[PDB]
């Protein structure tokens, strides 16, 4: 149809285009490279190309789609991994053995050579179905063991032909309904618009926790199923250290990495651990594969796939939560994704708000954001599912001036910020107390009353400790220690307790790889009542110097309390804290007699 | 006579299918017939889906719509575009409190539409300020850190400044859900003679906490005083233009022409400024200063000037802007220009909220410019000037004596330093510290606070009058 | 009390004196002449292509 | 297979059709379907043939940007000749112990490249799933970077460095002392196991041109390294396509004929320059500090040409040179740069004038990789725990200088009084190394073993117990 008129970059302006409608794919050049409608002047159609855009040639066809960027949905979306325009890297590599992506290849997304046991729903002929339903039941993997088909959202009718239980591919017909006169017949998958978020019955409160397992995050500054979360892209902490706690541990039941903006060996990196890491709260020795999909975008893919690589990411994390499962999207960079963003506006001349990047930065970061939330699945039957994004920042400057995280800290309920202080001195996760927050603490109250009653307390008073301490070694890295009171000393020692005990963790070790939220909130009784035991003592004219001396066994125990391998069981390990609260209780009256 | 209206009249509209491309955010039409520059039209997409749009350029048969929701979708081809012919009036009546918006007038609380007494236009013409009249009388909170030493009259336009992940929005809730006016009478200020209204708008607001407003305003009987109008973070950046504007709309319908007294909390101003740039943006104009267009002290100064008591009228608007300060400084330009619009500030600290003090209000910078006029025999208690006083002296002094607290010692503190901490301690955590539920009204918070001032000597409570003091603090 | 006197009013006079009153120029310098003239620069530049 | 389908000869078209020259571009009419990467070849008036590279096309227009300057071009008489295919470099394993200009012309006084194929410049990306993540540590030999920053064959780390400083030297250091901590020594001559070079010398000076090419002589490493010589009285827009030519060589050896090409691309600053100026001269929208918007990609398109393969026992080592044009890694080249390369070596103007060479400083350089090439089976088990203990006591030692400063020696604690020492005898002894010194990642460890030693082993906080106890008094 279409004949490419201009080609500037990954931009490409093509006439003849006057039925084109905004964002609609289109395959532009004699390869069929994929690019979408970004502006139209009449029959002139603006083109960002989703593949290297060398070699087109001012008159060869483009023929519009007609179809938005969609991503495809259904068996087989596990245990995959794509790129922004969700192309299967594995299925691309055995098309084509060369080590590089050929351009213009179009290999289906999912594969179409599996045949899935296929069970049907409860719909049956004559039910009038709607978006959302679920027609029937397919086992994709060990672990999700019911990969539960749904009828596409916008798409209703009288249903006229079910297919029975059996083995199908993923292109043969499974359900045949009737609307209106116009007969629709369904497969095992459908196509949806990654920029339109998928739609559900109503959005809840999500109100419960998803346990990351670092003990600062879990304990201070929690998350909740379907919360929206920034952390820094700086590795060593979080980074990597909180998205394999999240895809291990963590009571998600998919997860969705999005590798946006991300370096070719750091790519490299999460492509081979991730085969290589297992779950235990399946009840078996279980790939984390099986519960992933991850969206690989290498800094060099063009700017356009870096930019769609949020949202089919997205997309297919509202398409799992549809399901009643709670899946959790990683995005390795949100900043590169704003990079992207700011390109793209660059290449098409708009006004730029601040420091270059676009006017609706923060608008296109609370369209992502926004698709989180716990939801209601649209369609029957009743379930709930949850969409926990986990959105890393990459900081410009290791100040937050720039753009992104300003934009991103109007939208996120949780903000795990970075501390260069406590990076420097190799102090991980490193996690800024002063400056990170959680809104989800009032909304886990429901959750703590019936788990952990004084959980809430408890991280209070640390914060308290933690800040009043803070404000004391601001003052004595002028003054000095020496005109302190014992219990501004007292406040000091067991702020550096909690920062070097508690807040800080390994991570790469077995005792401390996942910190149990049972084994967590022990620990924050444990270190409170360290610094309650000690302040009482102090009040009752105790020196300090003399009770710490005298009291440095309880002290290391207090920091031993971190070598509890979590694997002991909760019964065992919470016996094990009682018994340190109890001895800690005994010395401090011994001691202060 | 009110049946002056005359608004049966039928005006047909005119719809265009002459698109002529699509740029961003805004659709432009090659052959509208004569164009109004903020006209509101509604575009039909080929799929059938219907999306507003107002009008942001008219040149020459040539009309540029900004559309709300996005553009994508739009073809030149099938789409068509229905010009209205008037700008965005809103749908006013006196029953309009009870009722949630969305951010562009229409109700999402599943209830009816509007039934307007009149369809009121949006930002409407600015007041005369011959017509205006000073502040005069106490707009109460219950919150004793606002109450007592950071008094809100009737007509004062006081922002709370603030950062992310304070809790702003949960004060906001809490002075949407506990303010009233504050003497006693032998009526009720529920009536129909002496009535008060809350318009609550929030711009930009997030899923989880616009869901917080309307669970808190719908379970604390808060809702039947206000009008909220929520703006998810997701909707239209034009439908957060307008909603402050839909707010303060209603709140000049009910005070200048109900004769309300009307409380405006517009929460996230930041939010709203970030959705100006967007807008300034989209016309191609160059930013200004912080990427911020140029412009916005006349945009927030028209905002915010929509508010004080009026000569003729009975009623007043009150408005507390919330806005978030970015990196937590008051050199960025939208707290910079709130405060020269705006009497005084009320600000909400972080190192109060870490130490798990709520409402984290710290009262050292927080000032109320026209606090005076709200405060005194007649306008809650003959005490309340000095008290604030006393407590804010008594509050530095601690301060201070905190500081030297880890440099001389304690016992090398003067006895008023060594009486300050336990002051500063009791003051921080027991009346500053007021429950997210906890209505204190402005006599309960004053004499909290005389029971704080009880503890200090006769000499050095040397800032509250000899007579009060003589009178309040010996019994 | 004479020497520990002395070394803390020194220290003050030169907070006082150097230390603040060099911090406040370099403070002025950074945002009053760098970050204006960065700014100018983005100004000339978008309206440069703004024209 | 031998199948080539070289034998189809293509006339060329040529246009005598210039219709203008704008600095480095020229910009063509009346051509036939342009394409868009096209090399042309445009014919001055005097008769010398200049190559250049179409940049943007529409319909008859082409967009032209000469690579050896547009000096003496001429519309009347000018004639370009569009050759119908992108840039291709002709590539043989015999280019190694080759000199080249930046435009792949031989300087050496030998003939032209005798093609084995003509590899495209910037060629197709690798996929992911095909790529294999380095982790096998190279021994650089300079005990700032083998001990902490350690580089594994495939990371693209570059070298930040300024006006002045010798970065030059450290590169040719690491150039001439490369290798694998545990290598594979399966044979008598390392042919497999030496490190290719191919450096690329961007619009830089000819003293340091001169001095590459003698340190390669001098250890007769230049049978193994390529030349791209792009000097500074070399045209400036050439300057885009020498790294391209150096990483589309770099992959001929390393992922066809299975070698280990380290890649040295010398002033990255000075190829954002001609970025920059071609960027002005297409009246582009300028990014920050006016380089183009699209900086980031390209820069990465450059970079992101590094790592290992599924299948081929090849791999392309990054050690990049870039300029910071100030002293300031928020500069928009290294701040992009570190975007997309693995950590990076930060050469500190402080540390020079203290005389200290290499003058590495450890705070900001960084390898993103460092932790997964070090460990039990790999160096030593000291490796990562010695390295964030040096980095944790660096860091402490700058803050405990910055106080000493303020407040003096006396006043600072044990810890800062530690902190001092070790940091002076850590940057005059661990830092400080010969220009020819070639220290054994053990040797360094050894040695920082030997400087911690200075602490008390129970403020050895960031070192695991195990490793403390077991290396500690191994003295």
Same mark, same amino acid.
């Given at each position: 149809?279409?004949?490419?008129?201009?080609?500037?970059?990954?931009?490409?302006?093509?006439?003849?285009?006057?039925?084109?409608?905004?964002?609609?794919?289109?395959?532009?050049?004699?390869?069929?490279?994929?690019?979408?409608?970004?502006?139209?002047?009449?029959?002139?159609?603006?083109?960002?190309?989703?593949?290297?855009?060398?070699?087109?040639?001012?008159?060869?066809?483009?023929?519009?789609?007609?179809?938005?960027?969609?991503?495809?949905?259904?068996?087989?979306?596990?245990?995959?991994?794509?790129?922004?325009?969700?192309?299967?890297?594995?299925?691309?590599?055995?098309?084509?053995?060369?080590?590089?992506?050929?351009?213009?290849?179009?290999?289906?997304?999912?594969?179409?050579?599996?045949?899935?046991?296929?069970?049907?729903?409860?719909?049956?002929?004559?039910?009038?179905?709607?978006?959302?339903?679920?027609?029937?039941?397919?086992?994709?993997?060990?672990?999700?063991?019911?990969?539960?088909?749904?009828?596409?959202?916008?798409?209703?009718?009288?249903?006229?032909?079910?297919?029975?239980?059996?083995?199908?591919?993923?292109?043969?017909?499974?359900?045949?309904?009737?609307?209106?006169?116009?007969?629709?017949?369904?497969?095992?998958?459908?196509?949806?618009?990654?920029?339109?978020?998928?739609?559900?019955?109503?959005?809840?409160?999500?109100?419960?926790?998803?346990?990351?397992?670092?003990?600062?995050?879990?304990?201070?500054?929690?998350?909740?199923?379907?919360?929206?979360?920034?952390?820094?892209?700086?590795?060593?902490?979080?980074?990597?250290?909180?998205?394999?706690?999240?895809?291990?541990?963590?009571?998600?039941?998919?997860?969705?990495?999005?590798?946006?903006?991300?370096?070719?060996?750091?790519?490299?990196?999460?492509?081979?651990?991730?085969?290589?890491?297992?779950?235990?709260?399946?009840?078996?020795?279980?790939?984390?594969?099986?519960?992933?999909?991850?969206?690989?975008?290498?800094?060099?893919?063009?700017?356009?796939?870096?930019?769609?690589?949020?949202?089919?990411?997205? %997309?297919?994390?509202?398409?799992?939560?549809?399901?009643?499962?709670?899946?959790?999207?990683?995005?390795?960079?949100?900043?590169?994704?704003?990079?992207?963003?700011?390109?793209?506006?660059?290449?098409?001349?708009?006004?730029?708000?601040?420091?270059?990047?676009?006017?609706?930065?923060?608008?296109?970061?609370?369209?992502?954001?926004?698709?989180?939330?716990?939801?209601?699945?649209?369609?029957?039957?009743?379930?709930?599912?949850?969409?926990?994004?986990?959105?890393?920042?990459?900081?410009?400057?290791?100040?937050?001036?720039?753009?992104?995280? %300003?934009?991103?800290?109007?939208?996120?309920?949780?903000?795990?910020?970075?501390?260069?202080?406590?990076?420097?001195?190799?102090?991980?996760?490193?996690?800024?107390?002063?400056?990170?927050?959680?809104?989800?603490?009032?909304?886990?109250?429901?959750?703590?009353?019936?788990?952990?009653?004084?959980?809430?307390?408890?991280?209070?008073?640390?914060?308290?400790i933690l800040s009043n301490a803070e404000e004391l070694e601001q003052v004595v890295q002028l003054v000095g220690k020496?005109?302190?009171?014992?219990?501004?000393?007292?406040?000091?020692?067991?702020?550096?307790?909690?920062?070097?005990?508690?807040?800080?963790?390994?991570?790469?070790?077995?005792?401390?790889?996942?910190?149990?939220?049972?084994?967590?909130?022990?620990?924050?009784?444990?270190?409170?009542?360290?610094?309650?035991?000690?302040?009482?003592?102090?009040?009752?004219?105790?020196?300090?110097?003399?009770?710490?001396?005298?009291?440095?066994?309880?002290?290391?125990?207090?920091?031993?309390?971190?070598?509890?391998?979590?694997?002991?069981?909760?019964?065992?390990?919470?016996?094990?804290?009682?018994?340190?609260?109890?001895?800690?209780?005994?010395?401090?009256?011994?001691?202060?007699? | 006579?009110?049946?002056?209206?005359?608004?049966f009249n039928v005006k047909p509209r005119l719809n265009y299918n002459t698109v002529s491309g699509v740029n961003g955010?805004?659709?432009?039409?090659?052959?509208?017939?004569?164009?109004?520059?903020?006209?509101?039209?509604?575009?039909?997409?080929?799929?059938?889906?219907?999306?507003?749009?107002?009008?942001?350029?008219?040149?020459?048969?040539?009309?540029?719509?900004?559309?709300?929701?996005?553009?994508?979708?739009?073809?030149?081809?099938?789409?068509?575009?229905?010009?209205?012919?008037?700008?965005?009036?809103?749908?006013?009546?006196?029953?309009?409190?009870?009722?949630?918006?969305?951010?562009?007038?229409?109700?999402?609380?599943?209830?009816?539409?509007?039934?307007?007494?009149?369809?009121?236009?949006?930002?409407?013409?600015?007041?005369?300020?011959?017509?205006?009249?000073?502040?005069?009388?106490?707009?109460?909170?219950?919150?004793?850190?606002?109450?007592?030493?950071?008094?809100?009259?009737?007509?004062?336009?006081?922002?709370?400044?603030?950062?992310?992940?304070?809790?702003?929005?949960?004060?906001?809730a809490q002075i949407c859900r506990q303010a009233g006016l504050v003497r006693p009478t032998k009526d009720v200020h529920?009536?129909?003679?002496?009535?008060?209204?809350?318009?609550?708008?929030?711009?930009?607001?997030?899923?989880?906490?616009?869901?917080?407003?309307?669970?808190?305003?719908?379970?604390?009987?808060?809702?039947?005083?206000?009008?909220?109008?929520?703006?998810?973070?997701?909707?239209?950046?034009?439908?957060?233009?307008?909603?402050?504007?839909?707010?303060?709309?209603?709140?000049?319908?009910?005070?200048?022409?109900?004769?309300?007294?009307?409380?405006?909390?517009?929460?996230?101003?930041?939010?709203?400024?970030?959705?100006?740039?967007?807008?300034?943006?989209?016309?191609?104009?160059?930013?200004?200063?912080?990427?911020?267009?140029?412009?916005?002290?006349?945009?927030?100064?028209?905002?915010?000037?929509?508010?004080?008591?009026?000569?003729?009228?009975?009623?007043?608007?009150?408005?507390?802007?919330?806005?978030?300060?970015?990196?937590?400084?008051?050199?960025?330009?939208?707290?910079?220009?709130?405060?020269?619009?705006?009497?005084?500030?009320?600000?909400?600290?972080?190192?109060?909220?870490?130490?798990?003090?709520?409402?984290?209000?710290?009262?050292?910078?927080?000032?109320?410019?026209?606090?005076?006029?709200?405060?005194?025999?007649?306008?809650?208690?003959?005490?309340?000037?000095?008290?604030?006083?006393?407590?804010?002296?008594?509050?530095?002094?601690?301060?201070?004596?905190?500081?030297?607290?880890?440099?001389?010692?304690?016992?090398?503190?003067?006895?008023?330093?060594?009486?300050?901490?336990?002051?500063?301690?009791?003051?921080?955590?027991?009346?500053?510290?007021?429950?997210?539920?906890?209505?204190?009204?402005?006599?309960?918070?004053?004499?909290?606070?005389?029971?704080?001032?009880?503890?200090?000597?006769?000499?050095?409570?040397?800032?509250?009058?000899?007579?009060?003091?003589?009178?309040?603090?010996?019994? | 009390?004479?020497?520990?006197?002395?070394?803390?009013?020194?220290?003050?006079?030169?907070?006082?004196?150097?230390?603040?009153?060099?911090?406040?120029?370099?403070?002025?310098?950074?945002?009053?002449?760098?970050?204006?003239?960065?700014?100018?620069?983005?100004?000339?530049?978008?309206?440069?292509?703004?024209?």
């Open positions: 149809y279409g004949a490419i008129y201009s080609v500037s970059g990954p931009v490409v302006i093509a006439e003849n285009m006057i039925g084109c409608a905004m964002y609609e794919l289109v395959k532009v050049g004699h390869d069929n490279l994929v690019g979408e409608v970004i502006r139209i002047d009449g029959d002139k159609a603006t083109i960002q190309v989703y593949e290297e855009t060398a070699g087109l040639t001012v008159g060869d066809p483009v023929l519009r789609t007609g179809k938005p960027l969609s991503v495809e949905l259904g068996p087989g979306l596990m245990e995959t991994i794509y790129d922004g325009i969700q192309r299967p890297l594995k299925a691309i590599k055995e098309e084509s053995q060369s080590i590089y992506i050929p351009r213009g290849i179009d290999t289906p997304a999912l594969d179409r050579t599996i045949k899935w046991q296929f069970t049907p729903g409860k719909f049956q002929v004559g039910d009038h179905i709607s978006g959302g339903d679920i027609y029937g039941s397919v086992f994709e993997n060990s672990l999700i063991s019911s990969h539960k088909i749904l009828l596409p959202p916008r798409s209703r009718g009288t249903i006229t032909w079910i297919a029975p239980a059996g083995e199908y591919t993923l292109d043969e017909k499974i359900l045949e309904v009737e609307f209106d006169g116009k007969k629709s017949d369904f497969t095992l998958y459908h196509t949806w618009p990654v920029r339109v978020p998928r739609p559900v019955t109503e959005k809840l409160s999500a109100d419960y926790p998803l346990l990351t397992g670092q003990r600062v995050l879990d304990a201070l500054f929690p998350c909740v199923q379907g919360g929206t979360t920034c952390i820094p892209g700086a590795f060593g902490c979080g980074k990597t250290v909180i998205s394999q706690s999240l895809s291990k541990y963590s009571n998600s039941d998919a997860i969705i990495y999005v590798g946006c903006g991300e370096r070719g060996n750091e790519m490299a990196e999460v492509l081979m651990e991730f085969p290589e890491l297992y779950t235990e709260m399946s009840g078996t020795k279980e790939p984390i594969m099986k519960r992933t999909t991850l969206v690989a975008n290498t800094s060099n893919m063009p700017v356009a796939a870096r930019e769609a690589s949020i949202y089919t990411g997205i %997309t297919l994390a509202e398409y799992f939560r549809d399901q009643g499962k709670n899946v959790s999207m990683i995005a390795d960079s949100s900043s590169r994704w704003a990079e992207a963003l700011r390109e793209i506006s660059g290449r098409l001349g708009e006004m730029p708000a601040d420091q270059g990047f676009p006017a609706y930065l923060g608008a296109k970061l609370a369209s992502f954001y926004e698709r989180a939330g716990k939801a209601v699945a649209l369609g029957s039957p009743d379930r709930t599912g949850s969409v926990s994004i986990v959105a890393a920042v990459s900081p410009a400057g290791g100040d937050f001036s720039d753009p992104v995280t %300003t934009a991103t800290l109007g939208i996120t309920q949780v903000f795990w910020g970075l501390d260069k202080k406590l990076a420097q001195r190799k102090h991980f996760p490193s996690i800024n107390t002063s400056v990170s927050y959680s809104k989800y603490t009032n909304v886990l109250n429901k959750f703590y009353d019936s788990n952990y009653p004084e959980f809430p307390v408890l991280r209070d008073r640390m914060k308290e020496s005109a302190l009171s014992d219990s501004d000393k007292i406040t000091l020692d067991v702020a550096t307790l909690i920062k070097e005990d508690f807040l800080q963790q390994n991570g790469y070790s077995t005792y401390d790889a996942f910190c149990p939220i049972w084994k967590t909130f022990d620990m924050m009784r444990a270190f409170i009542s360290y610094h309650d035991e000690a302040q009482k003592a102090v009040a009752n004219g105790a020196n300090w110097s003399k009770l710490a001396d005298s009291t440095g066994d309880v002290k290391h125990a207090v920091s031993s309390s971190k070598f509890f391998e979590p694997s002991r069981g909760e019964k065992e390990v919470h016996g094990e804290f009682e018994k340190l609260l109890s001895t800690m209780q005994e010395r401090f009256a011994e001691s202060t007699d | 006579k009110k049946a002056v209206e005359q608004g955010p805004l659709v432009i039409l090659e052959k509208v017939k004569f164009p109004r520059y903020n006209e509101i039209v509604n575009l039909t997409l080929p799929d059938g889906t219907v999306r507003q749009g107002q009008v942001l350029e008219i040149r020459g048969d040539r009309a540029i719509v900004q559309v709300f929701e996005g553009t994508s979708g739009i073809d030149v081809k099938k789409t068509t575009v229905e010009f209205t012919g008037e700008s965005l009036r809103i749908p006013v009546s006196e029953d309009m409190l009870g009722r949630i918006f969305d951010g562009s007038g229409r109700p999402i609380d599943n209830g009816p539409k509007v039934f307007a007494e009149d369809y009121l236009d949006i930002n409407g013409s600015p007041i005369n300020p011959y017509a205006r009249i000073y502040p005069e009388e106490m707009i109460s909170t219950g919150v004793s850190a606002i109450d007592t030493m950071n008094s809100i009259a009737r007509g004062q336009k006081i922002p709370i400044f603030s950062a992310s992940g304070l809790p702003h929005n949960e004060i906001a529920d009536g129909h003679e002496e009535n008060f209204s809350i318009v609550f708008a929030a711009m930009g607001v997030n899923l989880e906490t616009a869901r917080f407003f309307k669970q808190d305003f719908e379970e604390n009987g808060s809702l039947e005083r206000t009008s909220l109008f929520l703006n998810l973070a997701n909707d239209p950046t034009i439908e957060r233009i307008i909603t402050p504007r839909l707010a303060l709309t209603t709140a000049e319908y009910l005070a200048y022409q109900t004769e309300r007294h009307v409380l405006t909390i517009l929460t996230d101003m930041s939010s709203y400024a970030d959705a100006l740039r967007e807008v300034s943006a989209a016309r191609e104009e160059v930013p200004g200063r912080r990427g911020y267009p140029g412009y916005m002290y006349t945009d927030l100064s028209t905002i915010y000037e929509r508010a004080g008591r009026v000569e003729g009228r009975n009623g007043s608007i009150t408005q507390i802007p919330i806005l978030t300060m970015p990196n937590d400084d008051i050199t960025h330009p939208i707290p910079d220009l709130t405060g020269y619009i705006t009497e005084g500030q009320i600000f909400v600290d972080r190192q109060l909220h870490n130490k798990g003090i709520y409402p984290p209000i710290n009262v050292l910078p927080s000032l109320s410019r026209l606090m005076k006029s709200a405060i005194g025999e007649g306008m809650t208690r003959k005490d309340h000037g000095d008290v604030s006083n006393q407590l804010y002296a008594k509050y530095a002094i601690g301060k201070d004596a905190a500081a030297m607290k880890a440099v001389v010692g304690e016992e090398a503190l003067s006895i008023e330093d060594k009486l300050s901490l336990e002051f500063l301690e009791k003051f921080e955590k027991t009346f500053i510290t007021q429950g997210a539920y906890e209505d204190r009204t402005v006599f309960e918070s004053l004499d909290q606070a005389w029971s704080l001032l009880r503890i200090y000597p006769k000499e050095m409570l040397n800032r509250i009058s000899p007579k009060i003091l003589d009178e309040f603090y010996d019994r | 009390a004479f020497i520990i006197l002395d070394e803390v009013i020194k220290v003050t006079n030169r907070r006082v004196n150097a230390i603040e009153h060099v911090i406040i120029p370099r403070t002025e310098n950074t945002i009053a002449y760098i970050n204006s003239e960065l700014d100018e620069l983005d100004r000339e530049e978008f309206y440069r292509l703004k024209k």
